[PDB]
Amino acid sequence: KNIVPHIFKVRRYRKIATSVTVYRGHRESAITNKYELPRPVPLYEISHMDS
């Protein structure tokens, strides 16, 4: 009874949105990073981009 797991390839698409908020006082660095919320790719629009 073979036990080698089935293997294959896959392609994944992701959408990431992020912001930067660093100007505290006069000007600061890395004061507060945004939520960096990721989102799924658009249906058939990313496919058009994939096309």
Added chain:
Amino acid sequence: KNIVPHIFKVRRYRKIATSVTVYRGHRESAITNKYELPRPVPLYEISHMDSTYQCFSSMKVNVNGVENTFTDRDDVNTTVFLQPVEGLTDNIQRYFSQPVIYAEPGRVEATYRVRTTVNCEIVDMIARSAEPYNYFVTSLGDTVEVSPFCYNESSCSTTPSNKNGLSVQVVLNHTVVTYSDRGTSPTPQNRIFVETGAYTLSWA
């Protein structure tokens, strides 16, 4: 054929910078915590800090965008006494710089406060390696893909640090203070250091 994994000890150094911004409305609490970026140590000054083991430089000035000092208004090369703290673990005598949360004034401000602090962290841990001894892991959970045996009648390490996203440094007669809590006078032995993306590992 023996299967007991090779065991040894390791010492790690880290630099952490964090800020507290809580004065929302008039005065708020825990409005927004900073990124709390952990960073490696500058080796040379760190070695001097390691040699002192009771005086590590504060006010780290370092960032990918532009090196900026983050501290409680201190200087880059001035040192503070590391605090040997207790803990519930028989594998660590943790060593702290600035072991307290940032100032957090919480005064009457429109947006928030801007108080910030850094922290030099010196830790001792235990590392386990497999039979081939080409890579190993630490008790703290951090993983590294380098051979524990290197530059000791063996290849793959030298004094100049150069590797793919990694550093390979060997120091002869380094003579680590070997006791941060109570400075000692040990032998000047060799040692090897690696600077990671966020910290620095060290072992004999």
